[PDB]
Design a protein around this ligand. Structure first.
Ligand SMILES: Cc1nc(/N=N/c2cc(S(=O)(=O)O)c3cc([N+](=O)[O-])cc(S(=O)(=O)O)c3c2)c(COP(=O)(O)O)c(C=O)c1O
Ligand SMILES: Cc1nc(/N=N/c2cc(S(=O)(=O)O)c3cc([N+](=O)[O-])cc(S(=O)(=O)O)c3c2)c(COP(=O)(O)O)c(C=O)c1O
Ligand SMILES: Cc1nc(/N=N/c2cc(S(=O)(=O)O)c3cc([N+](=O)[O-])cc(S(=O)(=O)O)c3c2)c(COP(=O)(O)O)c(C=O)c1O
Ligand SMILES: *[C@@H]1O[C@H](CO)[C@@H](O)[C@H](O)[C@H]1NC(C)=O
Ligand SMILES: *[C@@H]1O[C@H](CO)[C@@H](O)[C@H](O)[C@H]1NC(C)=O
Ligand SMILES: *[C@@H]1O[C@H](CO)[C@@H](O)[C@H](O)[C@H]1NC(C)=O
Ligand SMILES: *[C@@H]1O[C@H](CO)[C@@H](O)[C@H](O)[C@H]1NC(C)=O
Ligand SMILES: *[C@@H]1O[C@H](CO)[C@@H](O)[C@H](O)[C@H]1NC(C)=O
Ligand SMILES: *[C@@H]1O[C@H](CO)[C@@H](O)[C@H](O)[C@H]1NC(C)=O
Lengths: 320, 320, 320
């Protein structure tokens, strides 16, 4: 007769723990995001073999772009190339572009590691280096690694405020991340205050265990996660978020592939009756906010189906 | 014996209503959006305490930006500051920036309400107002409220067409929002025509019950919801959307936080061998389309499971 | 007694096939995308009745825009209009804009096919064609169809590399699209190599059965689908993606509506103390990556619920 109560205890345990008497629903979410703070750049670069001093300040109009859905981007490093006009010009001398005769490169060949189409005229470029000119923006963007000291090493001191508004369309529930009458002068910390939305980039990066400086060379993809586990019943009602973070970039890289998250960005300007761009190579840690959650109620149909399913165990106990 | 039939009536009621014999599947959607119409601006502004006249016309290339996933943005108000070059200049005189001696502000101090880094030299700025210059774009954007009559008050007269294409990967179903052969010369109205996808911004704003002019000062976050509840069975087949709207912005605000949905945008231009931007403070009502729905079929496993579950009530009625 | 074993066979078949003993979880994904390759343009255009030669090269900074969430865009065709200053000028002569007297058009009338607000002065525009000037950017963008040979017909030769990182927050599982130690020098093909993420635009368009050249006139919306069906149990563990493609654009169009996916893009520049833009009409096939998947485990509660549900059939077989 011991199993006659043991089965009951097991069904009670499962019903209380898994919340089978609750009908779960999607989440529907909208994310609002503000990145604040400024950075200051003062350093030295080697462009085209010539030393130059980069000094200045970048504010909220410089180190980001208008919000792209549930995400936001932050400048981290850049390579600048000014005054590029369409024409024919030798490209950057690499292993696949060096030539000693015009026959070395064929006109119209589009090696998937260049910018432009070659014409097949191996001319000198610099220090008697023979390469065959391509039709593209001149001067051709020299292929070089990002500077070892990240230009925006101060970017880890930035702050970000996140407002999440989730919905449960099955029920009549729509709720926000920040409750009214709550202090905003604060910072996020798992133990000190896990409800404050203000996240510190240094903090989010150090919690995962990755040093910001290392990853600032080429950037990466970061994710914040907001989990919502909301009980909509009149009793034991609570709907509150939990914050976690992790790296969506592989971090292991590969010889064929390339680490970081980088892209090239264009800025056109006509001058002297000529057209010329100012494209920049851009390394920047794109953030992806990932918000997900569940919410149940007391729909009696689920309760009935589960009770009727578990009644057979009551039967079987007497059967055996 | 009355319960013997009452149970049967309950189970039938539950099966017909909740559609337990239907295996539900999530939704995969793609949103296409077009915002049309033009606006005209003719007003007066007080910039740097000088009166100026702003007159002109904004068209689809001006009052928006390229679509960002399942969303679209509309210009509502802006504050323009032209000709800003990098250099050291006094900032806007506020409570936290006013000084009487160089000792009042320390060099390198980055108060999180400023643009640029002070050097510690409290000089006059205007009307014998001593503030200490910071290194940033000059002249420093003066902190001012948006004008009381919203520059684009005509923006409520714009129209938006929405094409939703949803998928149900579990089944072989992919459908669209607009059926072929359906008039497009129309406007949305819950009673007149709830299938026409052309929404009027004044209409969507007024349905929720918020006046456009008040929210147009600082903007906010709007959301359209498209609910799909599609029955894929041969019999009683129907798959049609329903439109609803609501405000994802808090609308209650806070003294620490700030209402509306605003951001600063940059437009760079080199002139006289100097670099200068034209950054604009932007207030604009970001729209977020939220599309969700369910679709099921006649998978017999679900039917078998439910019927076996509910058989225990038939037996318990005889038990009791 | 045959049914006594037939029922057991059916329950075993259902449990093995549908995987009822697995608790399914949603998917949380992040998409990284790279589009590579270059294009060359050399053609002739008829702008304002005058022949011109368009020759040049477009690289990764020209034929796209920064990634917008889980999507990417590719230039396909464009109509350029340079030097547009704000002022009053006659618009493009169409059926609704031609007038013979000033009374034909009323000042302040905003026909929803125009750019600018008319003033009601029917003056000559070209070849003794009388239209009434509107206040907008001049010269008014002439309404013309895209060139019959698509300018970027070579865009089908582009390659795209996709890195998908999905999560199963219910379990402790986060995985990537590309496994380590896997060749990247390859191309996608359903039979040759369905794991290589490098997709060829000509390939993706031809698999669906749509010629690239025809859709390149006005563009369209393309969709890649990545299906993940991952078994997280220790035995029979596998978690691998499958690639499919389809057209989210209607492709049937309508007289009232308009085919393709086009938008107008703005590029401002101040010159001669005047403001002027360089807005371009843009036709480009927007790509929408759609990633979805399921993953289950061996939660015993689901197993117990299903077994209890199906025990009733064991009972009913003896009942009948
Ligand atoms: C030196 C350098 N290389 C970059 N990417 N190089 C790639 C990038 C790739 S990719 O990940 O397939 O885009 C390479 C791919 C293959 N492959 O065939 O598998 C071979 C190679 S390769 O090392 O032999 O030339 C690939 C090389 C990059 C990033 O890609 P990209 O600039 O060449 O477009 C940067 C960025 O600054 C860079 O500075
Ligand atoms: C006058 C004015 N103030 C703005 N934001 N002000 C904030 C904004 C914020 S924020 O919501 O935390 O970004 C403030 C936050 C705190 N706080 O510590 O909780 C204190 C304050 S404060 O009122 O004492 O200076 C905060 C003040 C804003 C919007 O933020 P911002 O321009 O300062 O970056 C505007 C925009 O037009 C504006 O015109
Ligand atoms: C010649 C031409 N027409 C375009 N769109 N035309 C529309 C576009 C539309 S729309 O799909 O409702 O935006 C039209 C809608 C309606 N309608 O009331 O249902 C009537 C008409 S109409 O043919 O009589 O003028 C609509 C016409 C377009 C695309 O829209 P748009 O440039 O006019 O803003 C292009 C693009 O280059 C174009 O070259
Ligand atoms: C961030 O700010 C603190 C406060 O002044 C400063 O001590 C620290 O050096 C800053 N971080 C970096 C990387 O400079
Ligand atoms: C918020 O924080 C401030 C100081 O940071 C403190 O004085 C105040 O009591 C806190 N609570 C409220 C409700 O302001
Ligand atoms: C919207 O257009 C109508 C039609 O002319 C006009 O009466 C109304 O004033 C416009 N809205 C605003 C805010 O001007
Ligand atoms: C559409 O509307 C027009 C007028 O708005 C009307 O003449 C026509 O009959 C309607 N139906 C169709 C199919 O065009
Ligand atoms: C794509 O590249 C191949 C390889 O040279 C070439 O034969 C083909 O013509 C190119 N496609 C187009 C549309 O030109
Ligand atoms: C990858 O491909 C290259 C040639 O495309 C081949 O030589 C090599 O064996 C392949 N495998 C690895 C692991 O490199």
């Amino acid at each position: 007769w011991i199993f006659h109560a043991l089965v009951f205890s097991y069904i009670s345990f499962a019903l209380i723990s898994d919340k089978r008497y609750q009908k779960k629903e999607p989440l529907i979410s909208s994310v609002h995001t503000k990145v604040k703070g400024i950075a200051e750049v003062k350093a030295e670069i080697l462009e085209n073999g010539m030393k130059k001093m980069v000094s200045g300040v970048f504010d909220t109009a410089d180190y980001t772009f208008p919000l792209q859905g549930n995400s936001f981007f932050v400048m981290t490093n850049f390579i600048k190339t000014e005054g590029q006009q369409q024409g024919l010009c030798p490209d950057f001398p690499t292993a696949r572009t060096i030539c000693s005769s015009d026959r070395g490169c064929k006109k119209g060949r589009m090696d998937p590691q260049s910018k432009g189409i070659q014409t097949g005229r191996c001319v000198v470029y610099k220090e008697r280096l023979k390469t065959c000119e391509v039709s593209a923006w001149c001067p051709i963007e020299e292929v070089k690694d990002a500077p070892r000291p990240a230009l925006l090493n101060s970017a880890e001191n930035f702050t970000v405020l996140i407002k999440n508004n989730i919905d449960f369309p099955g029920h009549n529930y729509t709720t926000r991340n920040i409750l009214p009458g709550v202090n905003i002068t604060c910072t996020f910390h798992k133990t000190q205050n896990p409800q404050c939305p203000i996240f510190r980039l240094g903090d989010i990066f150090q919690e995962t265990g990755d040093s910001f400086s290392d990853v600032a060379i080429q950037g990466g993809i970061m994710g914040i996660e907001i989990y919502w586990d909301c009980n909509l019943d009149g009793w034991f009602h609570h709907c509150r978020p939990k914050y976690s973070f992790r790296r969506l970039d592989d971090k292991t890289t590969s010889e064929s592939l390339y680490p970081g998250y980088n892209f090239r960005y264009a800025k056109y300007y006509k001058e002297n009756n000529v057209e010329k761009r100012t494209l920049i190579k851009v390394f920047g840690i794109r953030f992806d906010i990932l918000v997900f959650g569940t919410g149940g109620k007391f729909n009696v149909i689920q309760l009935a189906v589960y009770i009727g399913s578990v009644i057979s165990y009551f039967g079987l106990a007497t059967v055996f």
